[PDB]
Amino acid sequence: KINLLDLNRQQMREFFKDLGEKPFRADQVMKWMYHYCCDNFDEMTDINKVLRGKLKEVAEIRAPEVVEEQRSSDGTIKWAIAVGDQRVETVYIPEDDRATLAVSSQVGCALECKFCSTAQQGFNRNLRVSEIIGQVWRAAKIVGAAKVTGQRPITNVVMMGMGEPLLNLNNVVPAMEIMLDDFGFGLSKRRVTLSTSGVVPALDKLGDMIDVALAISLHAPNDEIRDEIVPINKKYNIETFLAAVRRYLEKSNANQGRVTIEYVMLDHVNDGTEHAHQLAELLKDTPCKINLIPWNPFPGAPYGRSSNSRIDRFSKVLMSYGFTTIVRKTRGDDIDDVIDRTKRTLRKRM
Numbered sequence: 001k002i003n004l005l006d007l008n009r010q011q012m013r014e015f016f017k018d019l020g021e022k023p024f025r026a027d028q029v030m031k032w033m034y035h036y037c038c039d040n041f042d043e044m045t046d047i048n049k050v051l052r053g054k055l056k057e058v059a060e061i062r063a064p065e066v067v068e069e070q071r072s073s074d075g076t077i078k079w080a081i082a083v084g085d086q087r088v089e090t091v092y093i094p095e096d097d098r099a100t101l102a103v104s105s106q107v108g109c110a111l112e113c114k115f116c117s118t119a120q121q122g123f124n125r126n127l128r129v130s131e132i133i134g135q136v137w138r139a140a141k142i143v144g145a146a147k148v149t150g151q152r153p154i155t156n157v158v159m160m161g162m163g164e165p166l167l168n169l170n171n172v173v174p175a176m177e178i179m180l181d182d183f184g185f186g187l188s189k190r191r192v193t194l195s196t197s198g199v200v201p202a203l204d205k206l207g208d209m210i211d212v213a214l215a216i217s218l219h220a221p222n223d224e225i226r227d228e229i230v231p232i233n234k235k236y237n238i239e240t241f242l243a244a245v246r247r248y249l250e251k252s253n254a255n256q257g258r259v260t261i262e263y264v265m266l267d268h269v270n271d272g273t274e275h276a277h278q279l280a281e282l283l284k285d286t287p288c289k290i291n292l293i294p295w296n297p298f299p300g301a302p303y304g305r306s307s308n309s310r311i312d313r314f315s316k317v318l319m320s321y322g323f324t325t326i327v328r329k330t331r332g333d334d335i336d337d338v339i340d341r342t343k344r345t346l347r348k349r350m
């Protein structure tokens, strides 16, 4: 059975044609899937039995399942999501005017960024389209589908710190196409943001495939620091990454001219005022908005949290050069064993 969550609108229409159905039936089923978060053909009431029968034989709608849910007092929701026998994260961050979903692109990651908890476990595999868009679908079903509640559950999707998306371009791009589709989640290209640590040839490729908002996972004011913090910098240095960013902005207007620059503040490693002055000089030819991230250590992380006074001084330095600078909020602060699986088998035996 084909999982319909693997298909963009064009592919859905091609599949429905091969079942002897008119293209617009594919569009209709898409709306049920994404506007109503429906994974059950019986519930699709304006589809006839014959078509319902065809789909149940050759197709299904199977989104990744929640294995854990944590809910913050600030409304943030974090999910551990089963993708096969592997696990990934999905985070829902509601605000008064919008709701952002952070989704995973890979199971683990191969880039070895030193501050990243996703890195420490290493790279396992790429996610399929159904596993990426399925995170959005699952989040949307739980929060409340657009046409069930009358409100878009999600206005923004981000891909950051949950696998390098540019190393999973085959699955990431169609997933984003469904996010942007009116019959999918109907998000503006300005509100689908792909963060990358700078896989430059893949970024050149991204701009030829799709127009979405780009963020750059920079985290350092110079190569010698970034070489340490973000090892991929050894292969593609800052100036090469920035040249690639400018090339991407020739092809895409989702950023409206200004790339988002992400920068984790790491205690006495990259958060000094000297580093801020260097960053300002570095970004003089790159129109941008700078997002400073008050990063917190995971168990055994090689860095500590920067104080808010150091972060605020770093920010003021950047603002004195005229950069738009945002210190990001920490969300879901209240929610932030190797034997357990075997231990559960033994306990359930009794």
Ligand code: SF4
Residues within 6 Å of the ligand: 109, 110, 111, 112, 113, 116, 117, 118, 119, 160, 161, 162, 163, 164, 197, 217
């Ligand atoms: S590219 Fe992103 S997910 Fe991968 S190790 Fe670096 S910060 Fe973590």
